[PDB]
Design a protein around this nucleic acid. Structure first.
Lengths: 53, 147, 52, 124, 52, 187
RNA sequence: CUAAAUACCGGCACGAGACCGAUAGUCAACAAGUACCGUAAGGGAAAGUUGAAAAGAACUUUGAAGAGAGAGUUCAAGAGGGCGUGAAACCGUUAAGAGGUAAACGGGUGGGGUCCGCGCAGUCCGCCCGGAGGAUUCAACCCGGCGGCGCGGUCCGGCCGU
RNA sequence: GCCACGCGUCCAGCGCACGGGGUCGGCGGCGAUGUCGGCUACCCACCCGACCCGUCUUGAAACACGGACCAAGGAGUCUAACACGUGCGCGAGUCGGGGGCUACGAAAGCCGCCGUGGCGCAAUGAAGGUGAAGGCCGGCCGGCCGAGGUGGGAUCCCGAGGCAGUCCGCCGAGGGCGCACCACCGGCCCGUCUCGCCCGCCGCGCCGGGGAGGUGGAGCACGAGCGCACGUGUUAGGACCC
RNA sequence: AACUUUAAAUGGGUAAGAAGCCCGGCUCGCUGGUGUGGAGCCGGGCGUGGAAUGCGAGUGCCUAGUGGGCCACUUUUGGUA
RNA sequence: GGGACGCUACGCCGCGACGAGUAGGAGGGCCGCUGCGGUGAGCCUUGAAGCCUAGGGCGCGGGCCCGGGUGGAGCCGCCGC
RNA sequence: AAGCGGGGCCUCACGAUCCUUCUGACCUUUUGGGUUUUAAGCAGGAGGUGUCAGAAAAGUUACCACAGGGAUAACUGGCU
């Protein structure tokens, strides 16, 4: 039931989307994991540049 | 802030702001945009004209990269180069017109919307409008095509 | 403020040292407790662990 | 300034207390003990403060200088008066009116000193 | 002075940041209100209580 | 029994600004004294506009302020804007000006002072002209917001040009039956 | 054929919480997927708290005993074994009042109880007078320190300039 | 009976009070083991009034439905999208949200040569595409003026006057610049319809474009958005609960 | 009531000025015996504010609930009521 | 040319007019519960929370503070979330 | 000739989206470019939804079921 004035909206929530919900609480922990593996790789190739070829 | 919401003032009221005759049922009018050719006809015509039907040609594999042709008006033409170049252009007695490369700043077409100050320019752009050219020639400038 | 004072550096025994440093213009910034309360109550929601 | 800092201390201050449909402030120089712009001891550049003496006999008069405004250790100078009741009220009246030192609170200091001397009077 | 700068010089460690401007300069309106310049262009104060 | 209607006996207007910032309130306190003690209506427009919401006191572009001082109160005369004074990039030459505003954008302060202008705050304006003598009060385009294009007479109605609420404009986004004379009808 | 960025409500070991607090939080804080039910697939509970320490009431007496009365432990049995705090519905008993239009209620009084006012001789505070007293005592000068202001008509020198 | 007190020239203090809302500079008693006071809350008596709540309903005390009593629990919540309003920071810009560098800290700060990209800054047409003022002067060219007008418009400006004689400020008949905004008439951009005169090039036509008058556009005509938060309302989600 | 020459009461529009009158003059590709007619532009002169009474008006967004009604005087339809 | 009060300006003061209410909407709560960041040199075994109360009271009201009893270990006021 | 006529002297005799068909062009796309079929577009008509602002639609239940409705019937009581 639309109101007086507004948009026509198509919310893509007719599937069982609540089961497939990806939270992002790993993001602060992921950044540490990316940094620690990057720092560990650099010490393995200590004379070579960290970026690579 | 749930303390600032309406439900804190609705405690003790039987119908909770939804009326006693027309109770707050589940879906009285149907889910979503139901009834376009039906009981919601007036709202779909008085507020969304042109919703129902097809018009135009279909285009199967459209790439938005091909249609990228950003435009810039003659208002913000001198804003592309720094203000120092504008002062020295009118200061110079030889008449050396500075070059403003439109593609360098990230635009391809030049439109003749605005007024141009009376000092010559050299405009390098991927495309030009008809009125944009005459305004540049009216000051004594040149339009240079570049790809 | 037009003129800024001269803050004196203090030693480890509480006596005033001879060195003096001009007060930074940061201490002359406008005082907006509403904005500080807006930022403080919003940044405290970021160091929060979810419960469900 | 005085008006700028008042708008901050008026609600979120540690010295302010509110209960029983009343509002008070426990500032060291807030004579009359009320939360107000005139009576705030910390807000203004020039402040008059009346406190009981350390030994219980007499009154100490708090005087705030205008030199070290951001130097609270030096900004306050304290003078002790341990004379008779009439002479004590004459001195506090002289320090405020004849020095033109924030003169709207001359009688308020007189009212406070008249009760502190009465408080240390021997109880019946 | 290098993390936020003064009003005539931007911060050297921030990319693009300067101290915010003041909405008003003389915040002590008590000095403003009894300043002579306003005091000429004022009407006479009416403070006689006229009850019913 | 009294046969009067209490439907609109309470006038709806702002008595004090809904902002909780203390610098505006000190400026409001200054102009409440000036409204009820001076006889000028300028201190009554400024005080009324200081209460107003952000959408009610639209930013004023610099080029508009140049344009209104090309037709000024006959030249030394200051400009008083309650809103924010913004910079315009499609203006070439700027004269020296006397501008009073609550806020000025950082580029506009450099542009005005480069031409020998002067920028005053509202507490400085009272010290300069307590009664608003020799002042021009300006304002930005109140209907300049994009919101007002959606307002007014509803679309799908004859001679009722009003922007509809569409997520994205295209060939298949409200160009059909309600718009096409070939398809159904048009208005 | 091939690691890395990627996923991980199972498992191992962790750390943490603006989360919930025994009708909440996992069904399960406890001999919980247990007791129990259905032929079976399966369904599926209720249930935390003495005391700091049992110091868990020795001994005497009635009763066949359950149960009591003394005595004893403890800071406290008014914490005595499903025992911390022990509300309401409900019941028993004591005190007061009342009682043929079911009971109950609003307004207005009146009477009786209940404790309280710690009321039972009803206010002090200033100014002036009187006389009895008792001081190390007033004003005015000298010395030292501190503070305020100054248009010092513009003294001198510092510091800063959104 | 009188809200009438002087001369010549020309045609002020003392008291009284039907007076800007009450005072007494007036009194009498009783108060230590039986007296005073105590709205309310404990109980009881009388007069008046008085049908048991919730809900559906035009209509409830109903012979309309739920309801023995008590304790605990118990029902518009969260995510996403949008619209409007408000507050904040910046401003024709705005924003890291994704990624890197430096117990609380999974925080906070920094990196725009990490702004890629989102929104806005240009629209119109199905699309090819096109894509936002003109006037004057001199002989299609060369100079000049150069960003529409009318009415209403809060505010600001001047001063005929008036508060022997100048300055300040006051107000002032009347005269103007006119903010925002409204109504109208015009002007410009795109599509469409009609009518012409023409010019021109790197490849002279079934070519390329201009002009004039109507018409359609969610356009231009000296910006206003971006980011965050709050409230309301409509939705998709279990969606106020059974 | 589905006839009407007549024809009320009640009722429904409009006007009671400053955006109104009276002049003078330009423009028009509209109309043409004729600066004919019309319209639009300007400039100027007229305030006793042109009936009574009463009252501050105008305007923009968002928006819940409602969309089962009933009764009373007068008029009136169906029906014996 | 030597002197009363005041003014938490989100405060104080003076005039007049008005006060119904279902659905529904809005505003104010120094009404109430729980937890978090600040804050009260806060309360507390010389007695916290909870519970009972024929007492004293306050506020129109949501409710709140003392007096008494029980209780034995935590709890509250203000500014925001 | 002034004039009248873009249907019937007037008050009535008719139809959205999508799809199909026809017509109109020195019109646009058909996808990396060119030519030609074809197909998709613009505009104007037609093919109809009579439940006529427009679903594609036969019955029975005495074996019946659910949410409801005294808004609605069979019985008593009311009005006539």
């Amino acid at each position: 039931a639309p109101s007086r004035n507004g948009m026509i909206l198509k919310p893509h929530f007719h599937k069982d989307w609540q089961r497939r919900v990806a939270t992002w609480f790993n993001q602060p922990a992921r950044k540490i994991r990316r940094r620690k593996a990057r720092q560990a790789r650099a010490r393995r190739i200590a004379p070579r540049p960290a970026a690579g070829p | 802030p749930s303390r600032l919401r309406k439900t804190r003032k609705l405690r003790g009221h039987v119908s909770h702001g939804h009326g006693r005759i027309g109770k707050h049922r589940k879906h009285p009018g149907g889910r979503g945009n139901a009834g376009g050719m039906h009981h919601h006809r007036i709202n779909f015509d008085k507020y969304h004209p042109g919703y129902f039907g097809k018009v135009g040609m279909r285009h199967y594999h459209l790439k938005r990269n091909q249609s990228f042709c950003p435009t810039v008006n003659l208002d913000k033409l001198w804003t592309l180069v720094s203000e120092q170049t504008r002062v020295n252009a009118a200061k110079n007695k030889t008449g050396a017109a500075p070059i403003i490369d439109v593609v360098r700043s990230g635009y391809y077409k030049v439109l003749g919307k605005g007024k141009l100050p009376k000092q010559p320019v050299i405009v390098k752009a991927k495309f030009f409008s008809r009125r944009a050219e005459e305004k540049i020639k009216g000051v004594g400038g040149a339009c240079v095509l570049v790809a | 403020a037009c003129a800024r004072p001269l803050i004196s550096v203090y030693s480890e025994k509480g006596e005033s040292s001879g060195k003096n440093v001009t007060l930074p213009a940061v201490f002359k910034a406008p005082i907006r407790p509403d904005i500080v309360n807006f930022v403080h109550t919003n940044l405290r929601k970021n160091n929060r662990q979810p419960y469900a | 300034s005085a008006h700028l800092q008042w708008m901050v201390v008026r609600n979120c201050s540690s010295f302010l207390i509110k209960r029983n449909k009343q509002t008070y402030s426990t500032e060291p120089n807030n004579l009359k003990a009320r939360n107000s712009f005139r009576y705030n001891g910390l807000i203004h550049r020039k402040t008059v403060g009346v406190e009981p003496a350390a030994d219980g006999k007499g009154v100490v008069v708090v005087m705030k200088r205008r030199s070290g405004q951001r130097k609270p250790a030096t900004s306050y100078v304290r003078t002790t008066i341990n004379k008779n009741a009439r002479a004590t009220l004459s001195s506090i009246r002289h320090m405020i009116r004849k020095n033109k030192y924030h003169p709207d609170l001359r009688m308020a200091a007189i009212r406070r000193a008249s009760a502190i001397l009465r408080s240390q009077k021997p109880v019946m | 002075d290098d993390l936020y700068g003064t009003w005539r010089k931007a911060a050297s460690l921030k990319s693009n940041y300067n101290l915010p401007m003041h909405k008003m300069l003389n915040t002590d309106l008590s000095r403003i209100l009894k300043s002579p310049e306003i005091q000429r262009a004022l009407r006479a104060p009416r403070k006689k209580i006229h009850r019913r | 029994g009294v046969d009067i209607r209490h439907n609109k006996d309470r006038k709806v207007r702002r008595k004090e600004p809904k902002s909780q910032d203390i610098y505006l309130r000190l400026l409001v306190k200054l102009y409440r004294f000036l409204a009820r003690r001076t006889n000028s209506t300028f201190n009554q427009v400024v005080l009324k506009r200081l209460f107003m919401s952000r959408t009610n006191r639209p930013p004023l572009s610099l080029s508009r302020m140049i344009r209104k001082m090309k037709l000024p109160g006959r030249e030394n005369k200051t400009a008083v804007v309650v809103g924010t004074v913004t910079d315009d990039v499609r203006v070439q030459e700027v004269p020296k000006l006397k501008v009073c505003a609550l806020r000025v954008t950082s580029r506009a302060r450099s542009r005005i002072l480069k031409a020998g202008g002067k920028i005053l705050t509202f507490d400085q304006l009272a010290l300069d002209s307590p009664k608003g003598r020799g002042t021009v009060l300006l304002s930005g385009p109140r209907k300049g917001r994009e919101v007002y294009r959606h307002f007014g007479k509803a679309p799908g109605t004859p001679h009722s040009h009003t922007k509809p609420y569409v997520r994205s404009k295209g060939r298949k986004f409200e160009r059909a039956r309600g718009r096409r004379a070939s398809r159904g009808y048009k208005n």
